[model samples]
Target chain A: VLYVGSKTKEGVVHDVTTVAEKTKEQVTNVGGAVVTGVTAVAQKTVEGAGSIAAATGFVKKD
Target chain B: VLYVGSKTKEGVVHDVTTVAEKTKEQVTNVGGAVVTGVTAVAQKTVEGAGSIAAATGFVKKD
Candidate 1:
């Protein structure tokens, strides 16, 4: 089961039901951000030297 | 620039280029895992009250 409610314009139920739904969305977003951040950081570390040599115009001797 | 080489079956060049590339892949995997873990954690946190109520068959009084 999932809570799916929103805050009212003026006054609403304002119960745990709404709180649960809002918290779930917020938590989910946070989780997504964490994943994105982790992926970017991991990718940044991977730098192939072959690519660097090619970039620097260094010929690989046989 | 990116390093994209692998260790040889019978002792290959084994240079920094290869090292860099291997490290990159390993790091990328780690990043992926981190993201997955974060997402799972967040999802677990978001449990709407309405859902709980429904689960418990609690009637919402008007």
Candidate 2:
């Protein structure tokens, strides 16, 4: 569910890079999300990036 | 970088609204939690109110 979000807090480049490098895998994820209609994987990606943006200091809870 | 992040955020933010309007399942809570946390920071620190309503509404709509 939070593949991207969790990874994002780990490293932005790593997660985006993971998908960026795996264009095919990403398409698979797109299909995965489309079929499951659950993960909303698109937002997962964005939310992942958002995690880092927020978690850095933006989100104090950690 | 955050301005870029903010723009990308809005670009992606609109998407979840459409998707979330559908099932409202999956990352419903998880996504909303992080999105909400990130959004509050986004409002005070960076993008101001632009990312506020869209993301908050998208999450709260459920």
Candidate 3:
């Protein structure tokens, strides 16, 4: 278990970013038609992370 | 595959909340110390989703 007792929002920003980037690559770079279902969730996962980043002031809404 | 091209920040808030809640429930309700590793990630997933909700004005910060 890697659950840190204390979580910093700033850290969450980076965490979200890391996850988003990987998810994006997974959705786009990995070319497989059968796994679109999984990739779709992964894409939303990044979108959720992006929304989190924006809310945390890591990025501005455009 | 559900690659929803159109995403609303507002929808993201609820999407995050839904994902987080299910993740929390999965982590807590499923009793298996052997699965701590998976549960740990799930817990963090909720934490991440929570961060997104807070950042998006779905909830406030502490």
Candidate 4:
């Protein structure tokens, strides 16, 4: 599932196979950043302050 | 900024957003993963033996 948790190292982020539903807490706890959640699609809106921004759009739409 | 970095797919992890601060070394070197800042927030608290957990609070505040 695209829904998962991970850990970050340097500029690299790694997934935590042990966790199920990932959170900001779990991501950080295991050394990864919590990017977003499935529910975020209904709750988040990031406007452009520059020509480009961090990862945008769902990785893949089903 | 609220610090950022993220990358993951399936059961794997991917991270490499240029470079920034994070670590036990930068929130332990940059990109996603690092949880709290150098200021507020408790490190982590667990329960129920790897059962239920998720992110909480402080998204819309400065």
- The residue ranges of model 2 lying beyond 4 angstroms of the native Cα positions read A1-15, A19-62, B1-58
Error of 3 at A62 (Å): 25
Put down candidate 4 lDDT per residue, A1-62, tens digits, no spaces: 22234432322223212222222232322323433322211111223332111222112121
lDDT string for model 1 (A1-62, tens) is 22234321221111111111111111222111222211110011113332221011112232
Best by lDDT: 4
In candidate 2, list every pair of residues with a backbone clash: none
Model 3 alpha-carbon miss at residue A60, Å? 14
The candidate with the higher lDDT, 1 or 3, is 3
Give the lDDT of residue A11 in candidate 3: 12
| Alpha-carbon lDDT, every model | 0.18, 0.23, 0.22, 0.25
Per-residue lDDT of candidate 4, residues B1-62 (tens digit): 12234442222222212222222232232233322321111112223432222333212121
Residues A1-62, candidate 2: write the lDDT tens digits.
21322212211111211111211212122211122211211222223222322321121222
Error of 4 at B8 (Å): 13
Model no. 2, DockQ: 0.04
lDDT of 3 by residue, A1-62 (tens): 23233332211111121111122211222111111111111112333432353221112222
Per-residue lDDT of candidate 1, residues B1-62 (tens digit): 22234321211111111111111211222111222211100111213322321011112232
DockQ of each: 0.03, 0.04, 0.06, 0.06
Clashing pairs in 3: A55-B55
**Residue pairs in steric clash, candidate 1?**
A35-B35, A48-B2, A48-B3, A49-B3
User: Judged by DockQ cut-offs, is candidate 3 incorrect, acceptable, medium or high?
Assistant: incorrect
Residue ranges of candidate 1 with Cα displaced over 4 Å: A1-22, A26-45, A49-62, B1-36, B39-62
